[PDB]
Each structure stands twice: as C-alpha cells, then as structure tokens.
Ligand binder design. Structure first.
Ligand code: HEM
Ligand code: HEM
Ligand SMILES: C[C@H](O)[C@H](O)[C@H]1CNc2nc(N)[nH]c(=O)c2N1
Ligand SMILES: C[C@H](O)[C@H](O)[C@H]1CNc2nc(N)[nH]c(=O)c2N1
Ligand SMILES: CSCC(=N)NCCC[C@H](N)C(=O)O
Ligand SMILES: CSCC(=N)NCCC[C@H](N)C(=O)O
Ligand SMILES: [Zn+2]
Lengths: 411, 407
C-alpha cells in the first residue's frame, strides 16, 4: 500500500512505501492520535529475527543480498546467539547501524547530514575512567575548534541489563541548575535534579549561573563516578547583539557542542545504553527554548525591560519582539566566533530537500511534524506546510529512563 | 483506557476518559501517525439518532425519563416511515454548540456555549439564503463588537437537493491570475474568483475586492449576490510606530465566517451552515499576509524597514513578521473591532482544556492546529500534550461544490 503527503505551499505530492517496512508501534490508534505526547533482558527467542532483519538491510545496502558473505554471516550470528545468547556486530555493521539510527530519527530536522557521522567504537571500554577518556576524545574531535563535526561514541551493549554502561548526563555539556531556598533557581532549571545528584556524589559546585556540569559515568553496571571535562575542551560563546550594546551586559553565554547522552541505540536487536552523539545547533534551540522557555533561563522579561518595550499588554507582542532579538544575537555570536550553528530557515529548507530526496531514493522519510517545526516563526518555514508521516524504523534512538531511577546501588 | 496528558512547562497532569466515547476514525494506526495530514440509510441513521438523543437527554439531566424514551420512539417512528427526521429546536441548538465544542482544531472553544444559532431550515431559495446570510453578517459583526453565530440551512435529503454556500468564507478577497504570471489579490481564492466571473461577476480587479456570495438552494444552480458593502466591516492596517506602514495599502475584514463546512448532528447532515466568530491576530498577520502562497508581503515590508535581507541568518523575515502582526492587532484595536492575540487566546484555551477535563473528562485537541504559526513555544499550548479524537456532533470538511454539482 502507498500513502501520499502533500506540501500545501508548492503542491508537491510524495508517495511513501517505506512505512511498510515498519513494526514498532506509534502510540496512536484509529480512535486516538498521540502525535503530541512527548513519550508515548531480551530473549534468544526474539533476538535472531531482529538480527536477521538488520543483516538483511545491511547486506541489501552494500548490494550483497543473498551473497555467500551474507549467508555465512546469518549462520554465524545465528550460531553465536544460540551459543552465547547475544552477538557482536562487525565494525561495518555498527557504523551502518548508527548512521541508520540517525537517518530514521523522525524528530530530527538535521538529518540531511546523516551519512557524515564519525563513529567511535568504545566497545572495548570497561571502566568509567575509560569512559571519560573516550568522551573527552569525542568532545575534542567534534568541537574541531568551532568547526563542528558530527560524531557518536558507542560503549558496550547491554547483556543481562545488570551490567549497563550509562552516561548519567542528559548531555555531555550542560550548565548546572541550583534551586535556592527562596524558591528561585540559579542556572539552568532543566538540570537541577541531576545537579543535586552530582553534588551528592561529591561535586563541589561553583554555584554560578553557567557552571559546566561534571560528567557522571557508569561502566559495566557499577556505581557511576564524577569527572571534570577539561575546560580547554569546552568551547563556549559569549552572547552579544549586532546592534544592542547592552546585550552583552546580560551576562549570557552558551556552549557550542550539543551532544545528547541519555538515549539508547538499538541495532539488530542489541541495545547500547551509552551512545552519546553530537552534531551542531540550530539557533532556536538556544535562543527560543534554552533562553526563553518559562521553565529554562526565562530571559524574555529582562531583555524586554532593556529594550524598554510596552510590557503592560501582551498584544504589544513585546514577548515576540524580544524573542527575535535574542535569536539574532545567538546566531550573530556563533558566526562571529566561527562556531558552527544553523538558523531555522536554512535548517528547515535543507530538511525539505533531504526529505524529498529520501522519498525518491528510499520510498519515505519518517518525520515528526510537532518536532520538526521550529518553536518560533512556524509558518514562515517550509516544514509547517509539509504533511509528514511518522513511523518507527530500526535501527533507532530510543528514550530510556533516568538511571538514578533504575540503578541498583552497590555502594 | 484512561489517558494522561501532561503540561511540561507547569507539570500539571490531566486524565482523559472522554476519548472512550470517541466514535469516528482518525487516520492514524499503531504503525503510522497522520497527525499532520490536513484531510486524513434507515439502518445507519437510527443508531446515530439514538446516540445523539441519549447525550442530549443526559445533558438536560433527563436520561432515561419518559420524555427521553418518547422522543426516541417518535424519532424512531419518523425514520422508519420517512427515512429521515427533524430536530427539535432545542436539539438543533445543543447540536451546534457541541459541534463547536468538539472541534479539535479550534483554539477559541472557551467561547463554545455562547453561540447564537439561527435556524434557516425554512429557507427554500438562494435569495432566501442571501437574506439569512446578511442578517447573520450584521448580527455577528455588531458594529465591531463581534458575536459568535451559525446559520443552519435545511439538512441534506437525497444529496441531490443540497444547500451549499460556494464561498469558502462569507467574506473573502478575490484572486486574479495575470498575463504577468503574477497574482493580484488573494491567490487562495483564484479559482473561485474565476467561477464567479464565469458566472457574471464584474470583478473590479483590484487587490482587496470583497467576493460576491454564490448560493445554491435545494440543489439548484447557484446564484451571485453582493453583500451590502455597509455590512462588510473592514480595517485599514497601520502600524503604531511605522508611519510608512499605511502606504503598503493593506486592509482586512473584521468577520471570519467559515462557510464551506458540513455540520453533522444526530446523523443528519447540514451542508450549508456558515459560522463565524472572530480573529486571532496571527491568522491574518502570519498566514493571510505572509504565507508565501497568500499575500506574501514579507519581501516588501522588510524593504520598508531597511533590514539586511542579504542572509536568512539576520532573521529579517522574523523581524518583519512580528511588526506586521503588531500592526494588525493595533489596527483592529484602534478601530474597536474584536480581535484576539495568540498569547491571550492560547492562555484561554489552556483554561478551557482544564475546564473540560474536570467537567467533561477530556477535550479533544489537535496540537498541530492549536499552536500558533508564530512564537509557538512562548505560547503555553506548545508545552501542552493534547489527545486528538473525533466526537460527534461535529463539523467536517466536504468536497468543493463545483467538483460535484451537476449543472
Ligand atoms: C548536524 C547537526 C544537527 C542538527 C542541526 C540537528 C537538529 C536537531 C534538533 C533542532 C532537534 C530537536 C531537538 C530539541 O528540540 O530538543 C533534533 C532532535 C534529534 N536529533 Fe538531530 N540534529 C543534528 C545532528 C544529529 C545527530 C548527529 C544525531 C545522532 C546521530 C541526531 C539525532 C537526533 C535525535 C535522536 C533527536 C530527537 C531527540 C529527542 O527525541 O529528544 N541529530 N535534532
Ligand atoms: C469566537 C472566537 C474564535 C476564535 C478566536 C477561533 C479560533 C480559531 C482558529 C485560530 C482556528 C484555526 C483556523 C485556521 O488556522 O484556519 C480555528 C479553526 C476552527 N474553528 Fe474556531 N474560533 C472562534 C470561533 C469559532 C466558532 C463560533 C466556531 C463554530 C461554531 C468555530 C469552529 C472552528 C472549526 C470547525 C475550526 C477548524 C476549521 C478548519 O479545519 O479549517 N470557531 N478557530
Ligand atoms: C507537548 C509537546 O509535544 C512538547 O512540548 C514538544 C512539542 N514540540 C517540540 N519540538 C522540539 N523540537 N523539541 C521539544 O522539546 C518539543 N516539545
Ligand atoms: C501540513 C500541515 O498539517 C498544515 O500546514 C497545517 C499545520 N497547522 C495548521 N494550523 C492551523 N491553525 N491552520 C492551518 O491551516 C494549518 N496548516
Ligand atoms: C545531537 S545534537 C542535535 C541538536 N542539534 N540538538 C540536540 C538537542 C539539543 C538541545 N535542544 C539543546 O538546546 O541543548
Ligand atoms: C469561524 S471563525 C474562526 C476563526 N477565527 N478563523 C477561522 C478561519 C479563518 C482564517 N484563518 C482566515 O485567516 O481567514
Ligand atoms: Zn497520530
């Protein structure tokens, strides 16, 4: 069966046959759409099929399907599973795997880049210290002095779910949040709970508004340990505005490298609970969400004051006005410092081209509209006008619960 | 069975049970989400009738009463012999108010129970239709102090005797393609604008020409009519700081009145049922003015502001978009035409959601439509999980009449 998606601004229609190759469920039914819901120990039994599909995909992509190297590999994985209960991916399969997980990531607008991913195989890693070293190398390689390069680091896969590798941080670089007793927060509110954990594990907190948090790291199921990323490794951009000279006096900066560390990489049935990955920022991530969410740094007001806008009635659109300035400032700052960042117009347009090309070559491109559309200026980006089809392909990045909720402390 | 929706900005969690009374289908499956697609018999009718009347009688606290049962019999007998049935006025009104209540794409539902319903079921001609329409337009406009209203023409019968308003709204601007290849006026109405001319309309062929109404009664060929100009309240668009803004020559009309939908109540289809409320500022300023396939004016406004349009990374479109929208809200407010800005409206819709949750057990909502097409995440609705489902009575889309009507 074929499915059509139309762009309402250009009238381009597209035909999706790829949704056919999908099995994981959406959270949706014929009676309810959960399209806007944020979050809607494997047996040998169900492991070989998962293996087989993956290797069928892998071998098709290299144009070797049905070959002797394809069959021998099936038979070998098959044997290794019955014998050992799991199996190891060749290097080639891991690389292909991680590329495809990104490729299939429907909430990601930056996927035009999916085929350029530096994969770092950390499956020989055994300790937290080994983790730290692997991560530092990732952060230095990916930063590249501001000329950001996409990368992922993949630690050993889950075995009995009792020996998991986990990065307790939600990102490799992120600013502390500290709840004061008067109810206010100092620094990033997103990070207060994690910050407290760090502190409880013995981190001495500078307690400022932009303190880079320590890596908290779990190897082989052992309690995690704290480590400071070398400061010279953390590239940061002080935030100024091309015409508002008081803007710098707002005391703002951000880090240049976004690197998600809390998700799970599934490939051919295997689960990698530690697989930090990094690309680069679209400006709105920082200027709209990180700075302006009410539950984040929440700077709209103080920027509004400084611009002396009529703040007395919402219909002045003073909020909308401050938001654009703040976003001009973020992009201006990054560009001036020659740190890679992309604006939301350029990013969404690229993505439309990627999506169209994906339909023509692959028969589909699963996409989550709620996520692909930027959080300001929605309809003046071409994605707003693009119908999308959202479905679940593997390999994939999945959510997993916070490890402090699951972890069994050895003390 | 019972579903949770969470607001991520405030942490409030709501439990939806209303979805288990969902009837219609969504387009989605376990395997695919179609959340962002725009348009995903005697025996048939009695179930629908019964289900509507049960909720109507439960709403008036008379579920199961003799009054309830008798009406179920009376409607049942009428179907059994006539093959359709007629709604009591009280049922007509409740049905309409609830069709709005259930409209998951409408951010403005906090207003739902204050709807003036005009029963035009005794109408028989397009002249009759025009007269009902003008009285609608005048009542709802109210000299700028807009009031919500729907007018309901006679329900479909054999679907060869359909009443239809061919305009997509009562009031909208014309669209002419030109030898220039460009488009003058509203390019969204270009094709209708033709059908009108193909029907005799003398287009003044300018940029903001209020289209003629094109009305079809009892399935007949439809007929042109010019709304008395004095009935069309319009706003010239100026900016509270850019004096030059007025020079752009922009105006919009005060009354949005969706005229092409189909109202379904208790299994009965009312295919002409124009309804109207009032505008959220972004509809005009963001979509109508700046959609690249609408008036697409960002290019020219950016010029007047002398912004650096050299690179997309100056956010010049974003800068302009904001001003354009300050101007619209400003114009309407200055002239005392009712209008709501996207901040105040989404705040109200969050409050409506919470009312419906504790009062009705849920509130179907389509996040993709509810989140405004500017400043999404600074409106509270961005951070609100919504569950979308299809309850009845409802408004549905229906084919354009010209693709259908036989001459
Ligand atoms: C090349 C630069 C990239 C850009 C500009 C980009 C852009 C984005 C943005 C804006 C989001 C939404 C994030 C949010 O709102 O929190 C996102 C989500 C996501 N991106 Fe990309 N991305 C890039 C590279 C990558 C890479 C290298 C990966 C992994 C290999 C990736 C995988 C994902 C995933 C899995 C999500 C969804 C995260 C979630 O569900 O919370 N992206 N991306
Ligand atoms: C009273 C003030 C109202 C406000 C502020 C309001 C707001 C809105 C907005 C912003 C939309 C999205 C429209 C678009 O983007 O095209 C919408 C759609 C809709 N509204 Fe409301 N509305 C109001 C009154 C009404 C009334 C009186 C009704 C019917 C009785 C109604 C029913 C609907 C329906 C059915 C849709 C979806 C129509 C479609 O699919 O295009 N609204 N409304
Ligand atoms: C409830 C709602 O889905 C939630 O706020 C989503 C909406 N869209 C989003 N889109 C992106 N890119 N990132 C987000 O965090 C969110 N949040
Ligand atoms: C393809 C996508 O569904 C389409 O552009 C939608 C998105 N959200 C919308 N939201 C509103 N309120 N009105 C619209 O016309 C649209 N268009
Ligand atoms: C793998 S990096 C992909 C990206 N461009 N963003 C990811 C999420 C970052 C987050 N939104 C933030 O604002 O820090
Ligand atoms: C029934 S009135 C509800 C409303 N406020 N808008 C409806 C659609 C109008 C459209 N967005 C426009 O910009 O003309
Ligand atoms: Zn869905």
């Amino acid at each position: 069966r074929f499915l059509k998606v139309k762009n309402w601004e250009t009238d381009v229609v597209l035909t999706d046959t790829l949704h056919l190759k999908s099995t994981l469920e959406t959270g949706c039914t014929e009676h309810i759409c959960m399209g806007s819901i944020m979050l809607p120990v494997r047996t040998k039994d169900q492991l070989f099929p998962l293996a087989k599909e993956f290797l069928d995909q892998y071998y098709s992509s290299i144009k070797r399907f049905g070959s002797k190297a394809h069959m021998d590999r099936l038979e070998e994985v098959n044997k290794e599973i019955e014998s050992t209960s799991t199996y190891q991916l060749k290097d080639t399969e891991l690389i292909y795997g991680a590329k495809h997980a990104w490729r299939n990531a429907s909430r990601c607008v930056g996927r035009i880049q999916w085929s350029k991913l530096q994969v770092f195989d950390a499956r020989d890693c055994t300790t937290a210290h080994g983790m730290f070293n692997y991560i530092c190398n990732h952060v230095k390689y990916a930063t590249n002095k501001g000329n950001l390069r996409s990368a992922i680091t993949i630690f050993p896969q889950r075995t009995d779910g009792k020996h998991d590798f986990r990065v307790w941080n939600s990102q490799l670089i992120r600013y502390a949040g500290y709840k004061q007793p008067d109810g206010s927060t100092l620094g990033d509110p997103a990070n207060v709970q994690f910050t407290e954990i760090c502190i409880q594990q013995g981190w001495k907190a500078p307690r400022g508004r932009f303190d880079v948090l320590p890596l908290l790291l779990q190897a082989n199921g052992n309690d995690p340990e704290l480590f400071q990323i070398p400061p010279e490794l953390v590239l940061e951009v002080p935030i100024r505005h091309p015409k508002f000279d008081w803007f710098k006096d707002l005391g703002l900066k951000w880090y240049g490298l976004p690197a998600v560390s809390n998700m799970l990489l599934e490939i051919g049935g295997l689960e990698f609970s530690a697989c930090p990955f990094s690309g680069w920022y679209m400006g709105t991530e920082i200027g709209v969400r990180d700075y302006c969410d009410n539950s984040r740094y929440n700077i709209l007001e103080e920027v509004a004051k400084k611009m002396d806008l009529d703040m007395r009635k919402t219909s002045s659109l003073w909020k909308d006005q401050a938001l654009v300035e703040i976003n001009i400032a973020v992009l201006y700052s990054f560009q001036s410092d020659k740190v890679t960042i992309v604006d939301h117009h350029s990013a969404t347009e690229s993505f439309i081209k990627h999506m169209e090309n994906e339909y023509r070559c692959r028969g589909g491109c699963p996409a989550d509209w709620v996520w692909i559309v930027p959080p300001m200026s929605g309809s003046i980006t071409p994605v707003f006008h693009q119908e999308m089809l959202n479905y679940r392909l593997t390999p994939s990045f999945e959510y997993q619960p916070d490890p402090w909720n699951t972890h069994v402390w050895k003390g």
